C-alpha cells in the first residue's frame, strides 16, 4: 500500500528503442555512442529480471505501432512496465528515424483507462533525448 | 477510481528546454549513470533515491569536452517527473 507490489510472476517488459541512424532528409546527426547505451540498458534490466526487447532505428510510424501493440498485450502477470527511448528530441518530442513523435502520443497508450492490465502498476519511461537547445554553463 | 495519469514516472535525461549530452564512445551521460546506480543500488534503495543519485552523478562527474568552444565545458542536470503513488523497490 505504501510500496508497489513487485512480486507478480514477472517484473515486466522493458522496451528499448535505440535510434542511431536518421534519414538524411531530416538533417539529424548519427548518434554515436548509443549502441553502448542500448547494451548497457539490456544487461542492467536483465539483471533486474525484466523481459528486455531491443528495437533499432524505428520510424515514427514503427514507434507508434510498437507502442500500441505492447500496450495491448496482457500484462496481468507483470509487476511494472519500462520503456527506454534513445533518440534526438525537442521539448515534448522524440524523433523516429524520419521525423517527430509527441511523447504524449506514446505514453497515452499506457494510460490508466487504456491499458487496464497495467492500471495501478508503475509505468516507467526513461528518455535520453534533447528537450530544446539551451546549454547549461554551470557554476563553480 | 484513480487518475488515468497516475502511476507514471518519466526519468528525463535533462531539464526542460535543454540539450542532453552523449559521449561518442561511452554513451549518454544519463544512461551511463542510470545503469551504474541501478547496478549499485537497485537491491537497496527506493527508485526515487536511485534517480536522485543519478542526478548527482550527472551533475558533478560530467562536463562537456568539445572542439567547438560554443559547446565546450557545459553541464547537465536530469529531470525526474513522478506521478507515482507508491514507492518502487526492484526486489
Amino acid at each position: 500500500d505504501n510500496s508497489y507490489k513487485m512480486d507478480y510472476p514477472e517484473m515486466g517488459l522493458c522496451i528499448i528503442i535505440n535510434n542511431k541512424n536518421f534519414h538524411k532528409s531530416t538533417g539529424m546527426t548519427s548518434r554515436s555512442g548509443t549502441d553502448v547505451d542500448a547494451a548497457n540498458l539490456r544487461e542492467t534490466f536483465r539483471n533486474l529480471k525484466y523481459e528486455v526487447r531491443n528495437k533499432n532505428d524505428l520510424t515514427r510510424e514503427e514507434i507508434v505501432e510498437l507502442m500500441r501493440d505492447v500496450s495491448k498485450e496482457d500484462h496481468s502477470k507483470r509487476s511494472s512496465f519500462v520503456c527506454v527511448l534513445l533518440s534526438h528530441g525537442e521539448e515534448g518530442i522524440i524523433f523516429g528515424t524520419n521525423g517527430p513523435v509527441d511523447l504524449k502520443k506514446i505514453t497515452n497508450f499506457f494510460r490508466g483507462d487504456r491499458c487496464r492490465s497495467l492500471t495501478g502498476k508503475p509505468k516507467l519511461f526513461i528518455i535520453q533525448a534533447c528537450r530544446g537547445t539551451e546549454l547549461d554553463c554551470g557554476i563553480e | 477510481k484513480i487518475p488515468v495519469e497516475a502511476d507514471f514516472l518519466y526519468a528525463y535525461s535533462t531539464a526542460p528546454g535543454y540539450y542532453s549530452w552523449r559521449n561518442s564512445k561511452d554513451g549518454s551521460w544519463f544512461i551511463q549513470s542510470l545503469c551504474a546506480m541501478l547496478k549499485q543500488y537497485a537491491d537497496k534503495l527506493e527508485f526515487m533515491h536511485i534517480l536522485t543519485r543519478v542526478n548527482r552523478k550527472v551533475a558533478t562527474e560530467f562536463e562537456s569536452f568539445s572542439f567547438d568552444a560554443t559547446f565546450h565545458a557545459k553541464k547537465q542536470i536530469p529531470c525526474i517527473v513522478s506521478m507515482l503513488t507508491k514507492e518502487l523497490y526492484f526486489y
Binding site: 546527426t29 548518434r31 554515436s32 555512442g33 533518440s87 534526438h88 528530441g89 535520453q128 533525448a129 534533447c130 | 535525461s13 540539450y19 542532453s20 549530452w21 552523449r22 559521449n23 561518442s24 549518454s28 562537456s64 569536452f65 568539445s66 572542439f67 559547446f71
Partner: peptide, 5 residues
C-alpha cells in the same frame, strides 16, 4: 568527444 542529442 561529447555530442548533443
Amino acid at each position: 568527444v561529447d555530442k548533443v542529442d
